[PDB]
Amino acid sequence: KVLRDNIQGITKPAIRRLARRGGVKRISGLIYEETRGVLKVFLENVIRDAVTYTEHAKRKTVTAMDVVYALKRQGRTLYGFGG
Amino acid sequence: RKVLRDNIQGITKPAIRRLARRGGVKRISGLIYEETRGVLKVFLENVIRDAVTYTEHAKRKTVTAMDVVYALKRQGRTLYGFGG
Amino acid sequence: KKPHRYRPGTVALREIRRYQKSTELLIRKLPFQRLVREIAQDFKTDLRFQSSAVMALQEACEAYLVGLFEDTNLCAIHAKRVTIMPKDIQLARRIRGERA
Amino acid sequence: KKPHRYRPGTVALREIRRYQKSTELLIRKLPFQRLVREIAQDFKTDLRFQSSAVMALQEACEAYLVGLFEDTNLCAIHAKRVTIMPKDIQLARRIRGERA
Amino acid sequence: TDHPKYSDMIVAAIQAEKNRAGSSRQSIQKYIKSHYKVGENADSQIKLSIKRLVTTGVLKQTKGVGASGSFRLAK
DNA sequence: CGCTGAAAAAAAACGCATCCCGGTGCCGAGGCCGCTCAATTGGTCGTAGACAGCTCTAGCACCGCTTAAACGCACGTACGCGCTGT
DNA sequence: GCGTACGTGCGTTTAAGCGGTGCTAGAGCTGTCTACGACCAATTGAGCGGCCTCGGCACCGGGATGCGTTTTTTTTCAGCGGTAC
Structure with a gap:
């Protein structure tokens, strides 16, 4: 459930913590699985691009920069890993 | 002799209805008509401001189709069929 | 014999079907044009406009609003409602990231 | 010698104040890392990552979700509710223009 | 409040609303x-x-x- | 009326967690210091853009007319909305 | 279940839209003259990687400060249902 299904490593109480930052008071049970689903889709979309940047650099190791360039491409630009 | 009126109200209740009807809207609060005007203003304002700015840069006194497009592109609302 | 009357919402639904299917601009072209120029005068005086540049704006506007309403409508429905209200819009725009 | 008990929602509110004010990442760093690599393997095999490239992702993720929740929360409230539900998210994303 | 009882106020409201x-x-x-x-x-x-x-x-x-809904007296 | 019993409305008492102290270690901001290269100088070359002039697009303004659409009003449905129970 | 805001329809009012007119602002193009920016070559200090040093900030435990929870403490009802005239 946690090794070829690491998604479950996104712990109910961790998702709670996030939503608590979001200013959420009360949280449906169905949400935990929903959130996983979305996070997957997100990381999928980003990493796909990030890797694609790596594949173009003929590297087999993914860099910080690769990620940033990808996040910028998914209109989610990130400061503090070197714009 | 080009000095303008209070034209926002020329956005007619029944015209706004028509739009929302396209939007798939069945029933429409009275307060919405004024709300919509407000938003449309802000929108046209934001766009035109830029569009004019493009014109001011070209030292033209006439605003072109292209000026508008370039502006709408800048407001993540890109427009097809007027070039660019 | 009473005169004939459709029940509240039955003509709305027709209007929807009618306007969804069609593509003609839904704001009257002059009142819009006048509006454009009025707002222009804020940023510079004695401004002229390509007939195409006006129409171009109008297209973008209508489509935007139609968009807004679609989203707004969904905000209304979400509140177990069928009538859009200011608060419905205000939400859409907030999520869309137009206002704060 | 007696039940002392905070009423449902009183600790939530505290938790909010606590986590709003702080900036430390809120997902456990390994379970996340493992997740990253698992998803990587979909697109290419035997891939390495700068320790910074992982952290970088995690930052973006958390912040996104926190964002989503903020918006989701507002979708819930709009329905005269205080409890976020799948349907609340599904709306946010629809308006945000992430899904159809 | 110089009033009747709350067992003769609801009974003096239904007798004044002949509703089926x-x-x-x-x-x-x-x-x-x-x-x-x-x-x-x-x-x-x-x-x-x-x-x-x-x-x-x-x-x-x-x-x-319960208490939400409409009532009338016996006969 | 007092019975009495309900039910609330307050206040005092208990427990709880946060903040502000006290400090004392530890690492990361801060700077010095060594080369290295990336800015600057100075001169030469060519062409991009400003200016004046010339064409003519197309943008604006005026008229009078038809008619589709805007406007207002009056009626009543059905939908927002609040309240109470489960 | 309660109530009025909203959709419908109809009769009255408005001015968009149409096809045309004539007038010229200013769009847009050309050609020429030169002032400005690329290109090179030649010098050199400003800003880089490396490297030391030291105080702020991170904890730690300890003690008040103001929250909140639950319980006792002063307050209504408030309704009967017997009471009394």
Whole structure:
């Protein structure tokens, strides 16, 4: 459930913590699985691009920069890993 | 002799209805008509401001189709069929 | 014999079907044009406009609003409602990231 | 010698104040890392990552979700509710223009 | 509030509303404030005295269940 | 009326967690210091853009007319909305 | 279940839209003259990687400060249902 299904490593109480930052008071049970689903889709979309940047650099190791360039491409630009 | 009126109200209740009807809207609060005007203003304002700015840069006194497009592109609302 | 009357919402639904299917601009072209120029005068005086540049704006506007309403409508429905209200819009725009 | 008990929602509110004010990442760093690599393997095999490239992702993720929740929360409230539900998210994303 | 009892105020509201469905808790909660004299915990004592005229049988409940809905008297 | 019993409305008492102290270690901001290269100088070359002039697009303004659409009003449904129960 | 805001329809009012007119602002193009920016070559200090040093900030435990929870403490009702005239 946690090794070829690491998604479950996104712990109910961790998702709670996030939503608590979001200013959420009360949280449906169905949400935990929903959130996983979305996070997957997100990381999928980003990493796909990030890797694609790596594949173009003929590297087999993914860099910080690769990620940033990808996040910028998914209109989610990130400061503090070197714009 | 080009000095303008209070034209926002020329956005007619029944015209706004028509739009929302396209939007798939069945029933429409009275307060919405004024709300919509407000938003449309802000929108046209934001766009035109830029569009004019493009014109001011070209030292033209006439605003072109292209000026508008370039502006709408800048407001993540890109427009097809007027070039660019 | 009473005169004939459709029940509240039955003509709305027709209007929807009618306007969804069609593509003609839904704001009257002059009142819009006048509006454009009025707002222009804020940023510079004695401004002229390509007939195409006006129409171009109008297209973008209508489509935007139609968009807004679609989203707004969904905000209304979400509140177990069928009538859009200011608060419905205000939400859409907030999520869309137009206002704060 | 007696039940002392905070009423449902009183600790939530505290938790909010606590986590709003702080900036430390809120997902456990390994379970996340493992997740990253698992998803990587979909697109290419035997891939390495700068320790910074992982952290970088995690930052973006958390912040996104926190964002989503903020918006989701507002979708819930709009329905005269205080409890976020799948349907609340599904709306946010629809308006945000992430899904159809 | 120089008033009758709350077992002869809801009974003096239904006799003045000849309705085949009855008089509701929201057609009674209005009648009590308009005509008679009442305090401020009125809409909370009408309710508390239409569970003590339901379990007994003084007051009959056409469509509803509890204190929300419409009632009328026995015969 | 007092019975009495309900039910609330307050206040005092208990427990709880946060903040502000006290400090004392530890690492990361801060700077010095060594080369290295990336800015600057100075001069030469060519062409991009400003200016004046010339064409003519197309943008604006005026008229009078038809008619589709805007406007207002009056009626009543059905939908927002609040309240109470489960 | 309660109530009025909203959709419908109809009769009255408005001015968009149409096809045309004539007038010229200013769009847009050309050609020429030169002032400005690329290109090179030649010098050199400003800003880089490396490297030391030291105080702020991170904890730690300890003690008040103001929250909140739950319980006792002063307050209504408030309704009967017997009471009394």
